[PDB]
Amino acid sequence: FLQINGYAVSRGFKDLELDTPSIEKRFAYSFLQQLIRYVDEAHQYILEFDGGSRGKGEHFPYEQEIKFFAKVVLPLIDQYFKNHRLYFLSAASRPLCSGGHASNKEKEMVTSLFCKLGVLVRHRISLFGNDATSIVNCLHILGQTLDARTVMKTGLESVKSALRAFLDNAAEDLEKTMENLKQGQFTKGVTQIINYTTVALLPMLSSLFEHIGQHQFGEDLILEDVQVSCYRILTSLYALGTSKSIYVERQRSALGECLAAFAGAFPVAFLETHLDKHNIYSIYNTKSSRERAALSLPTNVEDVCPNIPSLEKLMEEIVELAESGIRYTQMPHVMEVILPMLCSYMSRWWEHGPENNPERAEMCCTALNSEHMNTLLGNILKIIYNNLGIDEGAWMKRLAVFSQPIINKVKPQLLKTHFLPLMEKLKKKAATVVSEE
Amino acid sequence: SQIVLPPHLERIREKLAENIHELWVMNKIELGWQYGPVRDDNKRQHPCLVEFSKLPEQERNYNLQMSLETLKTLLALGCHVGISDEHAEDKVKKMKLPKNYQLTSGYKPAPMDLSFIKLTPSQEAMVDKLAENAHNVWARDRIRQGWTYGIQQDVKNRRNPRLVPYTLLDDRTKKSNKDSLREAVRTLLGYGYNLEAPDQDHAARAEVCSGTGERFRIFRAEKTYAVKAGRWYFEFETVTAGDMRVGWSRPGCQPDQELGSDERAFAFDGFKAQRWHQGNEHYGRSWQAGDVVGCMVDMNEHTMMFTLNGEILLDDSGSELAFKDFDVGDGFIPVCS
Ligand SMILES: Nc1ncnc2c1ncn2[C@@H]1O[C@H](COP(=O)(O)OP(=O)(O)OP(=O)(O)O)[C@@H](O)[C@H]1O
């Protein structure tokens, strides 16, 4: 009857104003702020636990707080970020183009949460009540969700300092692990440090470097003094990989995968020092002599790291071991560690290799050759089918995964005329319980 | 007119008025026209190079409301005029001026060192919007004085080629607006009144511009050419990547209905990498321009398969078949949407 009489009904209250553009009111904003504030509160709680652990009152006055944190906050972070990776990962590069691009402030807060969780997990495994696995899973997933370019271009200086200090602390801790392993073959504090390394520190670095290399955000994530932090990490990882001990052996795999990830992610060709002069991404080229002297640098690209030898020297070593036919039991460390990092470096630097860019010659970072990758693949396959009769290991599958990208870059036809003889030579030893692709 | 003028915008509008007069005299002296009572190109004279007081007041006012509309358009589009540094406002320095750049009169054309400030991609976007708006202003004026588009130039018929959208506009006029706005915005940035344009919004425009109700056109073979049994192959070549569906259809397919929405037809959508029959689910890979899609059906086994550039398309599952089972019915015919 209102319609018939013509009286037109409207809403009770016209909207006064729409505060839609502001991001602070958004659910993701509020949830991230909530998570950060609870993580920080747990941080000063663990500080009080540091002050009281030697003291009489070991029991938490904030027992409910710590148990709530461990049971709820960490798994909630895990599930939320696992479900919504794409929202944070989207950086105006159009992943999931339908919608859901995260605010830059929210990305800054994600990175700050990652830094805070790293600081919390640093040397506190014994402090955590068996929630160490949950915390390292949170670090893993959050490092996967981290977006580097957006924060680096537009981000708070405190966020810069937090990420840089987290990586610096990780580098210092792993350097101290290497030095105390070197000075003492035995295993206290050093035991808890090596437990921290092998349990949490190697996984977080491996995952972060894998993601950063995969998304190619390392270029701006590691430029200045974080580049030399990465230098220290690389030196320590290579020295541990070459290191000569039973504990380092039982941790072949963690150090090996971390070194492969670092080779994939790192933006300076450490294996080819002499050819980095033209590369602008070299910290020596960016710094110049004054900044090199201001920091702690030998000023020599070739002498930055003594333990890593020349790439050609490594290739000659690989080919001579392949010719000699060495065993896995005799000589495990190189075969577990060096080949994965070599393949990752292979794959990362084929882009700068002159094959993709014959133009702009002699500015190629590394003179990578198709015969070079094909020779490396031949050596790897030679070694694996030789060690096949030597009771082998899971490093069969590990090295197959590590060298699959190299096979992908290698031409089909150029791979052939060696592949089929190699494939059949594998076949008349393929008669084992494990099959290699 | 909806935008109000704040007192701070007024006081910086004064400085922008000296900016615009300095720009007048600097542009004229650089381009070579001398100073004169009347604006004559043949005489090489410009009251613009002359002081603005001697400049005709109609041109003075026109360029004043020019500046006013420019500022209000910046505010409406989303920038927020704000003072950054009191010291920057207080300090005013003249650029070093050669004798040739020196103007005939005594009003030295130097707001500040414009080269000091740096540039933003958002600043490029909003400067481009300003240039497009200024070209629209000129075109709208010419419309209300009756000027129309013409391939040649004739004042008698009032036809001008420049009366076109800014997208097709000539590089000369585009560069004129571009460098004028470079000078203006760089001067404003030197003042410290940064223009904070709003962030870009994520949206899919969907490119739905087709006239009238039809959104897609379905092409099919004749019903009499239906295949009851056998193994059949035909190729669909996509010239441009986009919303296409290719597959096999029953003779009862409705042209108005979209392919694969109902039981009428089985289709493959490369735009979303989804196979279509009574709904959609992820299958295969998205094609590109110039790709060829081969449609293969086995009525004897009731199995139908697709290819993209000679490679068998795969489900999210390992099953190679696009559609596992279907009744033969009354045969299928080739179809595309
Ligand atoms: N000294 C100048 N000489 C020529 N154009 C100038 C000068 N100063 C400013 N302009 C501007 O440059 C533009 C170029 O003029 P254009 O021939 O495109 O159009 P118009 O002369 O305004 O109109 P019409 O369509 O009748 O030619 C105009 O918008 C004009 O106002």
Short mmCIF file of N, CA, C and O in Angstrom, two decimals, chain A residues 22-101:
data_model
loop_
_atom_site.label_atom_id
_atom_site.label_comp_id
_atom_site.label_asym_id
_atom_site.label_seq_id
_atom_site.Cartn_x
_atom_site.Cartn_y
_atom_site.Cartn_z
N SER A 22 41.29 3.08 4.89
CA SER A 22 42.26 2.87 5.96
C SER A 22 42.43 1.39 6.26
O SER A 22 41.45 0.66 6.45
N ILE A 23 43.68 0.94 6.29
CA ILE A 23 44.00 -0.47 6.47
C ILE A 23 44.03 -0.89 7.93
O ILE A 23 43.89 -2.08 8.23
N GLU A 24 44.17 0.06 8.86
CA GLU A 24 44.29 -0.28 10.28
C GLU A 24 43.08 -1.05 10.78
O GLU A 24 43.18 -1.85 11.72
N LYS A 25 41.91 -0.83 10.17
CA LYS A 25 40.69 -1.42 10.68
C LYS A 25 40.48 -2.82 10.10
O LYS A 25 39.63 -3.58 10.57
N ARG A 26 41.31 -3.20 9.12
CA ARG A 26 41.15 -4.48 8.44
C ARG A 26 41.46 -5.65 9.38
O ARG A 26 42.27 -5.54 10.31
N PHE A 27 40.79 -6.78 9.13
CA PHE A 27 40.93 -7.95 9.99
C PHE A 27 42.36 -8.47 9.99
O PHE A 27 42.87 -8.87 11.05
N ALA A 28 43.02 -8.50 8.83
CA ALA A 28 44.41 -8.94 8.79
C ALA A 28 45.30 -8.01 9.61
O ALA A 28 46.17 -8.47 10.35
N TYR A 29 45.08 -6.70 9.49
CA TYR A 29 45.82 -5.74 10.30
C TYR A 29 45.67 -6.03 11.78
O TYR A 29 46.66 -6.14 12.52
N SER A 30 44.42 -6.17 12.24
CA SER A 30 44.17 -6.38 13.66
C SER A 30 44.75 -7.71 14.13
O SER A 30 45.32 -7.78 15.22
N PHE A 31 44.61 -8.76 13.33
CA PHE A 31 45.12 -10.07 13.72
C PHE A 31 46.64 -10.07 13.80
O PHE A 31 47.22 -10.66 14.72
N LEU A 32 47.30 -9.43 12.84
CA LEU A 32 48.76 -9.34 12.88
C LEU A 32 49.23 -8.53 14.09
O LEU A 32 50.21 -8.90 14.74
N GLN A 33 48.54 -7.42 14.39
CA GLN A 33 48.90 -6.65 15.58
C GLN A 33 48.72 -7.48 16.85
O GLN A 33 49.56 -7.45 17.75
N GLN A 34 47.62 -8.24 16.91
CA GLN A 34 47.36 -9.10 18.06
C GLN A 34 48.46 -10.14 18.22
O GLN A 34 48.96 -10.38 19.33
N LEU A 35 48.84 -10.78 17.11
CA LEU A 35 49.86 -11.81 17.16
C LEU A 35 51.20 -11.22 17.59
O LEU A 35 51.91 -11.81 18.42
N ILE A 36 51.56 -10.06 17.05
CA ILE A 36 52.82 -9.42 17.39
C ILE A 36 52.85 -9.03 18.86
O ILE A 36 53.86 -9.22 19.55
N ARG A 37 51.76 -8.45 19.37
CA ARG A 37 51.73 -8.01 20.76
C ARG A 37 51.82 -9.20 21.72
O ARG A 37 52.54 -9.15 22.72
N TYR A 38 51.13 -10.31 21.40
CA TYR A 38 51.27 -11.50 22.24
C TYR A 38 52.67 -12.10 22.15
O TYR A 38 53.20 -12.58 23.15
N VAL A 39 53.28 -12.09 20.96
CA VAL A 39 54.64 -12.62 20.84
C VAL A 39 55.61 -11.78 21.66
O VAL A 39 56.49 -12.31 22.34
N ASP A 40 55.47 -10.45 21.61
CA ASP A 40 56.34 -9.59 22.40
C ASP A 40 56.13 -9.81 23.90
O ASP A 40 57.10 -9.84 24.67
N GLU A 41 54.87 -9.95 24.32
CA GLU A 41 54.60 -10.22 25.73
C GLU A 41 55.24 -11.54 26.16
O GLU A 41 55.86 -11.61 27.23
N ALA A 42 55.13 -12.57 25.33
CA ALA A 42 55.84 -13.82 25.60
C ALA A 42 57.35 -13.59 25.63
O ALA A 42 58.07 -14.29 26.34
N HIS A 43 57.84 -12.61 24.86
CA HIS A 43 59.27 -12.32 24.87
C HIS A 43 59.72 -11.80 26.23
O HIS A 43 60.73 -12.27 26.77
N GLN A 44 59.00 -10.83 26.81
CA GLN A 44 59.44 -10.38 28.13
C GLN A 44 59.13 -11.43 29.20
O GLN A 44 59.79 -11.48 30.24
N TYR A 45 58.14 -12.29 28.94
CA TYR A 45 57.92 -13.42 29.84
C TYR A 45 59.14 -14.34 29.85
O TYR A 45 59.58 -14.79 30.92
N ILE A 46 59.69 -14.63 28.68
CA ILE A 46 60.87 -15.49 28.61
C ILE A 46 62.09 -14.76 29.15
O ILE A 46 63.02 -15.38 29.67
N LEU A 47 62.11 -13.43 29.06
CA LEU A 47 63.17 -12.67 29.72
C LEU A 47 63.10 -12.83 31.24
O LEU A 47 64.12 -13.03 31.90
N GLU A 48 61.89 -12.75 31.80
CA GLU A 48 61.72 -13.01 33.22
C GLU A 48 62.10 -14.44 33.56
O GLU A 48 62.63 -14.71 34.64
N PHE A 49 61.84 -15.38 32.64
CA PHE A 49 62.26 -16.76 32.87
C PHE A 49 63.77 -16.90 32.83
O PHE A 49 64.34 -17.75 33.52
N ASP A 50 64.45 -16.09 32.01
CA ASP A 50 65.91 -16.05 32.04
C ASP A 50 66.40 -15.53 33.38
O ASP A 50 67.39 -16.02 33.93
N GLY A 51 65.71 -14.52 33.92
CA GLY A 51 66.12 -13.96 35.19
C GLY A 51 65.80 -14.86 36.37
O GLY A 51 66.43 -14.76 37.43
N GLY A 52 64.81 -15.75 36.22
CA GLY A 52 64.36 -16.54 37.36
C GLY A 52 64.72 -18.01 37.26
O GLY A 52 64.53 -18.76 38.22
N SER A 53 65.25 -18.44 36.11
CA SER A 53 65.62 -19.84 35.95
C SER A 53 66.71 -20.23 36.94
O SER A 53 66.64 -21.30 37.56
N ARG A 54 67.73 -19.38 37.09
CA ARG A 54 68.72 -19.61 38.13
C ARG A 54 68.15 -19.31 39.50
O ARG A 54 68.66 -19.81 40.52
N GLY A 55 67.09 -18.51 39.56
CA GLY A 55 66.48 -18.14 40.82
C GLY A 55 65.58 -19.22 41.38
O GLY A 55 65.41 -20.30 40.81
N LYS A 56 65.01 -18.91 42.55
CA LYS A 56 64.18 -19.88 43.27
C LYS A 56 62.87 -20.13 42.52
O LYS A 56 62.50 -21.29 42.28
N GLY A 57 62.18 -19.07 42.11
CA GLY A 57 60.88 -19.20 41.48
C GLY A 57 60.90 -19.69 40.04
O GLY A 57 60.64 -18.92 39.11
N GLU A 58 61.20 -20.98 39.84
CA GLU A 58 61.23 -21.53 38.49
C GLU A 58 59.83 -21.58 37.88
O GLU A 58 59.66 -21.36 36.68
N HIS A 59 58.82 -21.87 38.70
CA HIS A 59 57.46 -21.97 38.19
C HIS A 59 57.01 -20.62 37.65
O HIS A 59 57.29 -19.57 38.24
N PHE A 60 56.33 -20.65 36.51
CA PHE A 60 55.91 -19.41 35.86
C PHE A 60 54.77 -18.77 36.65
O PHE A 60 53.73 -19.39 36.85
N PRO A 61 54.95 -17.52 37.12
CA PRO A 61 53.77 -16.75 37.54
C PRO A 61 52.81 -16.52 36.39
O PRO A 61 51.61 -16.32 36.58
N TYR A 62 53.35 -16.54 35.17
CA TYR A 62 52.60 -16.40 33.93
C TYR A 62 52.47 -17.76 33.23
O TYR A 62 52.60 -17.90 32.02
N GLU A 63 52.24 -18.79 34.07
CA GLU A 63 52.08 -20.15 33.57
C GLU A 63 50.94 -20.24 32.56
O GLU A 63 51.09 -20.85 31.49
N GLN A 64 49.79 -19.65 32.89
CA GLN A 64 48.68 -19.64 31.95
C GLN A 64 49.06 -18.94 30.66
O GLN A 64 48.71 -19.40 29.56
N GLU A 65 49.81 -17.84 30.76
CA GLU A 65 50.23 -17.11 29.57
C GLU A 65 51.11 -17.97 28.67
O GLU A 65 50.87 -18.05 27.45
N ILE A 66 52.12 -18.62 29.24
CA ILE A 66 53.04 -19.42 28.43
C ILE A 66 52.33 -20.61 27.81
O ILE A 66 52.53 -20.93 26.63
N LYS A 67 51.50 -21.31 28.59
CA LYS A 67 50.80 -22.47 28.05
C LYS A 67 49.80 -22.07 26.97
O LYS A 67 49.69 -22.74 25.94
N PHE A 68 49.07 -20.97 27.18
CA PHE A 68 48.19 -20.46 26.13
C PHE A 68 48.97 -20.13 24.87
O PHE A 68 48.57 -20.52 23.77
N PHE A 69 50.09 -19.42 25.02
CA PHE A 69 50.94 -19.11 23.88
C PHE A 69 51.30 -20.38 23.11
O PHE A 69 50.93 -20.53 21.95
N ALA A 70 51.94 -21.33 23.80
CA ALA A 70 52.45 -22.53 23.13
C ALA A 70 51.33 -23.33 22.48
O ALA A 70 51.48 -23.83 21.36
N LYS A 71 50.19 -23.47 23.16
CA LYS A 71 49.14 -24.34 22.65
C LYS A 71 48.35 -23.70 21.51
O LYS A 71 47.92 -24.40 20.59
N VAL A 72 48.15 -22.38 21.55
CA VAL A 72 47.22 -21.71 20.64
C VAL A 72 47.94 -20.82 19.64
O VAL A 72 47.74 -20.95 18.43
N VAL A 73 48.76 -19.89 20.13
CA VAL A 73 49.25 -18.80 19.29
C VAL A 73 50.10 -19.34 18.15
O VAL A 73 49.92 -18.96 16.98
N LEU A 74 51.03 -20.24 18.46
CA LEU A 74 51.91 -20.78 17.43
C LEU A 74 51.16 -21.62 16.39
O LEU A 74 51.33 -21.37 15.19
N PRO A 75 50.33 -22.61 16.77
CA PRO A 75 49.58 -23.34 15.74
C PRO A 75 48.63 -22.46 14.95
O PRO A 75 48.39 -22.72 13.76
N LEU A 76 48.07 -21.43 15.58
CA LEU A 76 47.21 -20.50 14.86
C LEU A 76 47.99 -19.76 13.78
O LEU A 76 47.51 -19.61 12.65
N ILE A 77 49.20 -19.31 14.11
CA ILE A 77 50.06 -18.68 13.10
C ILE A 77 50.35 -19.66 11.98
O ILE A 77 50.24 -19.32 10.79
N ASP A 78 50.72 -20.89 12.34
CA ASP A 78 50.99 -21.93 11.34
C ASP A 78 49.83 -22.07 10.37
O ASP A 78 49.99 -21.90 9.15
N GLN A 79 48.64 -22.38 10.89
CA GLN A 79 47.50 -22.66 10.03
C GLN A 79 47.09 -21.43 9.23
O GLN A 79 46.80 -21.53 8.03
N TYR A 80 47.06 -20.25 9.86
CA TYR A 80 46.65 -19.04 9.16
C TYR A 80 47.56 -18.74 7.99
O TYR A 80 47.09 -18.50 6.87
N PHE A 81 48.88 -18.76 8.21
CA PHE A 81 49.78 -18.39 7.12
C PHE A 81 49.86 -19.48 6.07
O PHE A 81 50.01 -19.19 4.88
N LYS A 82 49.73 -20.75 6.47
CA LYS A 82 49.68 -21.83 5.48
C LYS A 82 48.45 -21.69 4.59
O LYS A 82 48.53 -21.90 3.37
N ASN A 83 47.31 -21.32 5.18
CA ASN A 83 46.09 -21.17 4.39
C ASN A 83 46.15 -19.93 3.51
O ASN A 83 45.63 -19.93 2.39
N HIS A 84 46.79 -18.86 3.99
CA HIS A 84 46.80 -17.58 3.29
C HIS A 84 48.20 -17.15 2.86
O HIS A 84 48.56 -15.98 2.99
N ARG A 85 49.01 -18.09 2.36
CA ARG A 85 50.30 -17.73 1.79
C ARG A 85 50.15 -16.68 0.69
O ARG A 85 50.88 -15.69 0.66
N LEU A 86 49.20 -16.89 -0.23
CA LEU A 86 49.12 -16.07 -1.43
C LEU A 86 48.82 -14.61 -1.11
O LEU A 86 49.27 -13.71 -1.82
N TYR A 87 48.06 -14.36 -0.04
CA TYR A 87 47.69 -12.98 0.29
C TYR A 87 48.92 -12.16 0.64
O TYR A 87 49.10 -11.04 0.15
N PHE A 88 49.80 -12.71 1.49
CA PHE A 88 51.03 -12.00 1.83
C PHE A 88 52.05 -12.07 0.70
O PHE A 88 52.78 -11.10 0.46
N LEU A 89 52.11 -13.19 -0.02
CA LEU A 89 53.12 -13.35 -1.06
C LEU A 89 52.86 -12.43 -2.24
O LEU A 89 53.80 -12.04 -2.95
N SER A 90 51.60 -12.08 -2.49
CA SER A 90 51.27 -11.18 -3.59
C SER A 90 51.89 -9.81 -3.35
O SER A 90 51.67 -9.19 -2.31
N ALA A 91 52.66 -9.34 -4.33
CA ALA A 91 53.43 -8.10 -4.23
C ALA A 91 53.24 -7.24 -5.46
O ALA A 91 54.21 -6.76 -6.06
N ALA A 92 51.99 -7.05 -5.88
CA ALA A 92 51.63 -6.33 -7.10
C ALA A 92 52.20 -6.97 -8.36
O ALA A 92 52.14 -6.39 -9.44
N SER A 93 52.76 -8.18 -8.23
CA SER A 93 53.20 -8.97 -9.37
C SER A 93 52.11 -9.89 -9.88
O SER A 93 52.37 -10.71 -10.78
N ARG A 94 50.90 -9.78 -9.33
CA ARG A 94 49.70 -10.52 -9.70
C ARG A 94 49.81 -12.03 -9.49
O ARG A 94 49.62 -12.79 -10.45
N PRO A 95 50.10 -12.51 -8.28
CA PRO A 95 49.72 -13.88 -7.93
C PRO A 95 48.32 -13.89 -7.33
O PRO A 95 47.99 -13.06 -6.48
N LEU A 96 47.50 -14.83 -7.79
CA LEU A 96 46.08 -14.87 -7.45
C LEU A 96 45.42 -13.53 -7.82
O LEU A 96 45.00 -12.74 -6.97
N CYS A 97 45.36 -13.29 -9.13
CA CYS A 97 45.03 -11.96 -9.64
C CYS A 97 43.59 -11.57 -9.32
O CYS A 97 43.20 -10.41 -9.51
N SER A 98 42.78 -12.52 -8.85
CA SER A 98 41.40 -12.20 -8.48
C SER A 98 41.35 -11.14 -7.40
O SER A 98 40.53 -10.21 -7.45
N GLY A 99 42.22 -11.24 -6.40
CA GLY A 99 42.29 -10.25 -5.35
C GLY A 99 43.13 -10.75 -4.21
O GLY A 99 43.69 -11.85 -4.25
N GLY A 100 43.22 -9.92 -3.17
CA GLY A 100 43.93 -10.29 -1.96
C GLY A 100 45.37 -9.86 -1.88
O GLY A 100 46.19 -10.61 -1.35
N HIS A 101 45.72 -8.68 -2.40
CA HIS A 101 47.07 -8.17 -2.24
C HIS A 101 47.25 -7.55 -0.86
O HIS A 101 46.46 -6.70 -0.45
#
